[PDB]
Design a protein around this nucleic acid. Structure first.
Lengths: 140, 662, 232, 44, 174
RNA sequence: GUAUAAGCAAUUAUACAGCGAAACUGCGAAUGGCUCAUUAAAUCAGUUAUCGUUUAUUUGAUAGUACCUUACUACAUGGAUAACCGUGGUAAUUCUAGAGCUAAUACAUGCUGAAAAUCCCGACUUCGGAAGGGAUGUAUUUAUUAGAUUAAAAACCAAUGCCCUUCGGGGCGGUGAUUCAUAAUAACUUCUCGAAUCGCACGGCCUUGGCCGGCGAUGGUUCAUUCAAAUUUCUGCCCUAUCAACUUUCGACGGCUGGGUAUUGGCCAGCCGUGGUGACAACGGGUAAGGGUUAGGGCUCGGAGAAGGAGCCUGAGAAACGGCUACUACAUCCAAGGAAGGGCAGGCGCGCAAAUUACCCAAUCCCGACACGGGGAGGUAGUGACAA
């Protein structure tokens, strides 16, 4: 490995830390502001910008390096039954070390440039709840 | 000419020599016009460096070729990257003995020239030209590049460099065909400045009239009017002259140079940059005048000939600056106050110290927008070093005025070293004069700034006379505003303020009434309101204590535990409704207190009191109050119900108010 | 080489222009939002008959678009481009109607001398100079410093100088250039931001009909001030 | 596993890589000298 | 043979799909270039839109920025010392982006002694980190390559300094 | 743009002039179309984004960049070829050898009339116009700085005030965002551009030796716009559990580092982590491969290969099947040394059968140096007792 760095801030000078806001009515967290952690895919530290679709969901597998899996539940109308049917969709989003991850919470994600085959979104604001395991079902 | 170069190099290679033999490919690749930079950087700092054995056999032909490629105008593009970067590259990659042989090649006729003789000037030299000015421009740009790349290795080549550049400069100023000589003069002075701060160890004394002929004749009668726009190369030469120790006494030769420098500083229509530039010249002059033995080899002259016959003009001009225009840049301000700081210990007697003390207290009562607090600390150091001259016994109205300023700065500053210097300026205040009283203030403020056992001893000792009192009042309210180490400094300063206000209510003789009553109003009441807005709860408790002392001891003055708290608030409601209140009292003491009470049935009692007091107060203050409250709504999402209950009660109060005023 | 039916239905062709239809060439205006010069001459104006006739007319310097002579047959002239024909001395301007079709209007020189163009955007060009991009793909150097995006500019058309400007304003009258409610002259009454893409304006007519069009399709014509002669 | 991209030797037969060249035995020595030399290397 | 398409990899759900199409021209990715140390060898490659990009195969000099003081100089390149990607690349002396390599110090030392005056590597504004001083006394500095030598045709980068400098000393000692 | 055709057609001031074969130069051929094992939300359709990229042509603007030791100088820029003329070889057509020319908007260099030029400031000023002070493009790539009133921001904010008064009053660049746009310094490139071009009118100053002077055509750096192309975000397939486990068997999911790509990206190479999918139907199997325009029907739009693998070439756009290169499978000419080459349409397909080998680009439309050249879409025509 090499030394990690923000791309164009001059460190060893004998005479700062850059972090941008995404906007959209969001507030950068304090761990993103002052925490010396560094990553290129963070929208508040790296050069990734967020634009386009804004989505929500509930994390299912937080046991992964800075990427969560989101179950997207919705109600599918089948005409044959003329009834609504539950359908779960599995997304992904790059998780910043700025926030405190909780399993089962409610997380808002945002569309970015494709960082991986699955990672297309960045987390913006977690909402802490008491969400349970796979057996819990709810439209979100 | 590149074709003539190719044929010449073919002839030199026809001179079949073992020295040139291993380098012919480097020569032809240096010469091919598409391989120049790459061939250069493979020649130097490559594997096949020049072997030092036949280096004396290869270097002359290589250097003539390097001069040809640095002189070529055909293949060059424009800009600095057009041929200037090439010359800089060649001189950067060259070596110093190689540079000496190269400058021998570069100075054609001017190699063996003598600019100075056993006598001063050689007019027989200067009234004869050996070079066209185009070649002079080329030579001079070349030599500026040489010096800029050389640095400290100039020492074995001075006896040629200074002769060349001085001949060019003096022929230029005699020509003062104008464009060529103009660019000659400007780049000449630039090379000269670089040469000066490169070579300090040279002896510059055998020519002085050369600096005379360069400086005094064409410019000095016009120099402020000219340099009102920006800095110049002459100004750079004077700046590096003042930087160098041994070069400074060249300013004595014409005695009007430093007068005209501060005359440039006098012209108030400058771009402020020539102002701060002349100021830095003065900075280096004073640092030289203070510096040890290495500069005391010349200090005694620069004390007795350069600064001494012009201190009056210096201070008169600095005063004209600080009282001419209402607009002064912060850089000019900090830099001017820094110059007067460093000039303070360098003078012993003068004439304009009355003006100096007046301008000091003027810039000290200037608002915080115009003057930074660091700058106020600088004016304080100025005051300490400038007060000690024997002036205050005359013109006492100036002296009671400056004492009002130093007192005012006791509740303003934040820094321990600034407060130490405050105690020191008070010390020399007493040393100048009333004397024992102000010395009591000296020991009081000394044991205030000295640590915590000494401070509490100070508070108790003064706990155990108007001008005696006022600074103690200032530092007393500052130590009110200090929240807590253990809170003891706050409580003891509160007790001291009660002792002061007890002295206030003790003395009630009618001119003393007037004086002390205006003092206690104009220093205490805004400090009460500022401490009311202070969110420190120990500060609010002690300000409630001293406010209780005020209202209980004063009352002839015309302008004057949850359960017990709520009961006292109900008592305050009844006090309102038996007598409405004073409006400023309401709006600047009571409202912030219960605002703090809300945001820290207590809330219901608080908003009921806010309702009754919003009945009691004035509508313009109410208009600002309502704008501040809806701003609290928009900005504070922490207490939505709390702020909106406040809104409901206050506009119900508005409805009752308009219903009563109907 | 699309068919006549697949050609856009707002530059009209009757049932006898053959199975084909010309495609516009590359130019300032967009492909869907264009009226080509041959269709303007021989299908709408009928000042000629045949492709060769229009070729000859456009080959001699006889048709001038936006103050400049246009040579080729299928030069696009989409929206509000004045067309000066000197042998008749007439000037034609392209507006829409309430249904959403190209409508040609006759004008003399006084109102034909200037154009009204919507500002696409504004930036700083090379050299540190602000420049201004219209929807006509015209770039104006050194503009008025108040002219933001979605402004409108009255343009001299002889020196290209910025003669006047009109501001995006709620309470102003507009004209729609896209969407399902395309071509409905009315007043802007409301703006909705919707930060995150596709801001909307709410625009009613002069006669009480509300509808939602997007800012990109909105084309400011004037508060009351119909600076171009709309057909009566 | 950490090893998919060839990092472990997958001992699997390859279809095209099956029957490229026949062994042509080119050794000028009668193999008794050679293995007697392998016996009488440095070690004996 | 070489391409950039994603048809041959497995699905997001872990499925294999035939999805059999032909490799077209816009998923073209060209062959890599092991940029090594030698005389200047650069092959020009025209790309889409007729842009030119310069594949540098053998490089001797590049420029490096000692922009802490505000200078940069074109110096030679001795040889790579460490590389974050491949130890085989460190062995084969290849120059890529983010590659720490010892460079010659002579133009920098020339500029230093010319500007400030004091000799280095043999007042209060001319000051050096001692590790950088040791690099100057040896005469072979630690710099990093941050220009892409493959897609820009030039080896340029900044000198190492301070925290990254000591981190890379420790990494070299690892 | 290039004419000395030894090409025509002429004279009233003779380098050229009108027309102009051949040839050089620039553009064009990313399709019009043919065949066949198929593609089961990956394509596709809606719906977004490109702050992740490219773009010949379109139209719009656009570039201040001198001097800088050649000086006892230089001042109408170079060299090649084609067409042509003549000498030939072989069986073999420009398959071509030798020899002799000449042009450019083909390929290329490119200090100079001069003591100035051009930007910034500007004191003094009669709007006077200026004394005299600083400075010398662009493209690539890197580093750094600015990208904006102060940061001792202890500012501004409590203008709830202060002061006068007649008490009525009066005074005190863009985005949602970016390291974006943009500017500046250090250098860097075996690195570009900053017009040695053509046609037409031809007027002002009079140093009568010129000095200035317009309209276009072609070309050129950047930025738009257009035509596009590339990926890309949420939803939507037909049926099945004799398909319940699948992936890691071409990395399966990450993060970091680079390479390559126009750009993002396990797309690929190292390093380590442990996954990712599934009974809400993964995965497999079957092959039978619609959308929009709403009275209606109509209308419109909708993978692999050019004898076979493999590699390469031009170009803004192709892995063109247009070319080449080697192998394989065929086939043709010959003086037996050698040389070039690969498709579709028609008829028979029993010995007995049945719709033209038609005409033109005339209109709509397309491509070019270009009004004139060229178009396998398009229309016109002929046959018919199968019907009606």
């Amino acid at each position: 490995r090499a030394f990690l760095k923000q791309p164009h801030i001059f460190l060893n000078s004998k005479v700062r830390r850059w972090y941008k806001d995404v906007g959209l009515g969001f507030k950068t967290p304090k761990t993103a502001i002052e925490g010396h952690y560094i990553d290129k895919k963070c929208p508040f530290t790296g050069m990734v910008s967020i634009r386009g679709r804004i989505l929500t969901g509930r994390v299912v597998s937080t046991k992964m390096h800075r990427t969560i899996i989101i179950r997207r539940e919705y109600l599918h109308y089948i005409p044959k039954y003329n009834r609504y049917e539950k359908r779960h969709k599995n997304l992904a989003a790059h998780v910043s070390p700025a926030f405190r991850v909780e399993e089962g919470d409610m997380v808002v994600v945002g569309q970015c440039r494709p960082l991986s085959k699955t990672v297309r979104f960045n987390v913006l604001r977690v909402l802490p709840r008491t969400g349970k395991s796979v057996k819990k079902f709810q439209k979100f | 000419d590149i074709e003539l170069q190719k044929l010449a190099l073919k002839a030199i290679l026809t001179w079949k020599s073992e020295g040139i033999k291993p380098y012919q490919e480097h020569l032809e690749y240096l010469l091919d016009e598409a391989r120049f930079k790459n061939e250069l950087t493979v020649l130097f700092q490559g594997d096949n460096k020049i072997l030092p054995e036949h280096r004396s056999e290869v270097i002359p032909v290589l250097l003539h070729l390097l001069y040809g490629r640095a002189i070529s105008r055909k293949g060059a593009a424009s800009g600095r990257h057009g041929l200037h970067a090439t010359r800089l590259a060649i001189i950067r990659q060259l070596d110093v003995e190689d540079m000496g042989s190269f400058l021998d090649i570069g100075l054609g006729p001017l190699r063996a020239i003598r600019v100075v003789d056993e006598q001063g000037v050689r007019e027989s030299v200067f009234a004869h030209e050996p070079l066209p000015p185009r070649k002079q421009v080329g030579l001079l740009n070349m030599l500026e590049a040489v010096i800029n790349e050389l640095g400290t290795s100039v020492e074995p080549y001075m006896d040629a460099l200074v002769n060349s550049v001085l001949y060019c400069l003096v022929n230029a100023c005699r020509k003062l065909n104008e464009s060529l000589y103009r660019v000659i003069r400007t780049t000449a002075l630039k090379s000269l400045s670089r040469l000066f701060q490169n070579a300090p160890d040279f002896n510059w004394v055998p020519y002085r009239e050369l600096m005379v002929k360069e400086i005094i004749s064409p410019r000095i009668e016009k120099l402020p009017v000219e340099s009102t726009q920006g800095v110049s190369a002459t100004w750079r030469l004077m700046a590096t002259w003042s930087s160098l120790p041994k070069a400074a006494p060249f300013l004595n030769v014409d005695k009007r140079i430093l007068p005209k420098i501060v005359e440039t500083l006098s012209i108030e229509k400058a771009k402020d940059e020539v102002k701060v530039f002349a100021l830095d010249i003065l900075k280096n002059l004073i640092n030289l005048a203070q510096a040890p033995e290495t500069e005391s080899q010349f200090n005694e002259l620069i004390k007795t000939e350069l600064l001494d016959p012009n201190t009056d003009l210096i201070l008169k001009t600095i005063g004209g600056v600080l009282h001419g225009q209402s607009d002064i840049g912060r850089e000019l301000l900090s830099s001017a106050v820094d110059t007067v700081v460093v000039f303070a210990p360098m003078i012993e007697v003068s004439s304009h110290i009355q003006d100096m003390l007046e301008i000091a207290t003027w810039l000290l009562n200037q608002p915080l927008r115009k003057v930074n607090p660091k700058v106020k600390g600088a004016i304080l150091l100025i005051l300490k070093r400038f007060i000690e001259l024997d002036d205050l016994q005359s013109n006492q109205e100036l002296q009671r005025k400056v004492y009002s300023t130093i007192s005012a700065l006791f509740g303003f500053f934040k820094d321990k070293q600034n407060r130490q210097t405050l105690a020191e300026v008070l010390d020399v205040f007493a040393r100048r004069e009333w004397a024992q009283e102000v010395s009591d203030i000296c020991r009081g403020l000394n044991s205030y700034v000295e640590d915590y056992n000494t401070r509490l001893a100070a508070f108790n000792s003064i706990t155990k006379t108007l001008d005696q009192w006022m600074p103690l009042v200032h530092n007393l309210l500052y130590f009110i505003q200090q929240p807590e180490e253990f809170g003891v400094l706050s409580s003891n300063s509160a007790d001291g303020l009660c002792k002061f206000i007890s002295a206030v209510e003790s003395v009630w003789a009618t001119p003393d009434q007037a004086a002390w009553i205006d003092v206690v109003a104009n220093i205490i009441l805004p400090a009460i309101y500022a401490g009311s807005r202070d969110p420190s709860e120990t500060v609010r408790r002690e300000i409630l204590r001293v406010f209780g002392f005020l209202v209980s001891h004063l009352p002839q003055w015309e302008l004057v535990a949850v359960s017990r708290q709520l009961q006292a608030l109900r008592v305050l409601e009844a006090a309102n409704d038996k007598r409405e209140f004073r409006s400023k009292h309401i709006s600047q003491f009571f409202i912030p207190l219960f605002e703090h009470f809300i945001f820290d049935g207590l809330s219901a009692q608080a908003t009921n009191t806010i309702a009754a007091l919003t009945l009691s107060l004035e509508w313009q203050q109410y208009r600002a109050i309502l704008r501040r409250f809806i701003s609290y709504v928009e900005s504070k999402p922490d207490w939505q119900k709390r702020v909106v209950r406040l809104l409901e009660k206050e506009v119900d109060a508005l409805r009752t108010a308009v219903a009563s005023k109907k | 080489h699309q068919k006549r039916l697949s050609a856009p239905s707002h530059w009209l062709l009757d049932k006898l222009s053959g199975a084909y239809a010309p495609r516009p060439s590359t130019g300032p205006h967009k492909l869907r939002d264009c009226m080509p010069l041959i269709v303007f001459v021989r299908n709408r104006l009928k000042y000629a008959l045949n492709y060769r006739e229009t070729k000859a007319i456009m080959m001699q310097r006889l048709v001038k678009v936006d103050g400049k002579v246009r040579t080729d047959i299928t030069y696009p002239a989409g929206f509000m481009d004045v067309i000066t024909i000197e042998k008749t001395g007439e000037n034609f301007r392209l507006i829409y109607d309430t249904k959403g079709r190209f409508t040609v209007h006759r004008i003399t020189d006084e109102e034909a001398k200037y154009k009204l163009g919507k500002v696409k955007r504004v930036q700083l060009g090379r050299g540190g100079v602000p420049f201004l991009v219209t929807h006509d793909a015209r770039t104006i150097r050194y503009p008025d410093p108040l002219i933001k995006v979605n402004d409108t500019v009255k343009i001299d058309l002889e020196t290209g100088k910025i003669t006047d400007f009109i501001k995006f304003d709620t309470g102003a009258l507009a004209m729609i250039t896209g969407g399902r409610n395309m071509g409905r002259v009315g007043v802007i009454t409301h703006r909705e931001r919707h930060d995150g893409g596709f801001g909307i304006v709410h625009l009613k007519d002069a006669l009480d009909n509300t509808f939602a069009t997007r800012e990109s399709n909105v084309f400011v014509i004037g508060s009351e001030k119909p600076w171009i002669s709309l057909p009566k | 596993r950490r090893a998919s991209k060839g990092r472990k030797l997958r001992y699997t037969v390859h279809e095209k890589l099956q029957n490229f060249m026949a062994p042509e035995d080119r050794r000028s020595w009668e193999e008794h000298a050679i293995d007697r030399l392998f016996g009488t290397l440095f070690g004996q | 043979g070489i391409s950039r398409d994603s048809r041959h990899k497995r699905s997001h759900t872990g499925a294999k799909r035939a999805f059999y199409r032909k490799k077209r021209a816009f998923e073209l990715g060209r062959q890599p270039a092991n940029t090594r140390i030698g005389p200047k060898r650069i092959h020009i490659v025209r790309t889409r839109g007729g842009n030119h990009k310069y594949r540098a195969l053998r490089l001797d000099s590049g420029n490096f920025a000692w922009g802490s003081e505000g200078c940069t100089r074109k110096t030679r390149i001795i040889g790579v010392v460490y590389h974050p990607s491949n130890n085989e690349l460190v062995r084969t002396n290849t120059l890529t982006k983010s590659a720490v390599v010892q460079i010659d110090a002579a133009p920098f030392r020339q500029w230093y002694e010319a500007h400030y005056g004091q000799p280095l590597g043999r007042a209060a504004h001319g000051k050096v980190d001692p590790a950088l001083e040791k690099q100057f006394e040896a005469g072979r500095l630690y710099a990093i390559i941050s220009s892409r030598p493959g897609q820009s045709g030039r080896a340029d980068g900044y000198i190492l300094e301070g925290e990254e400098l000591a981190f890379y000393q420790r990494k070299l000692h690892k």
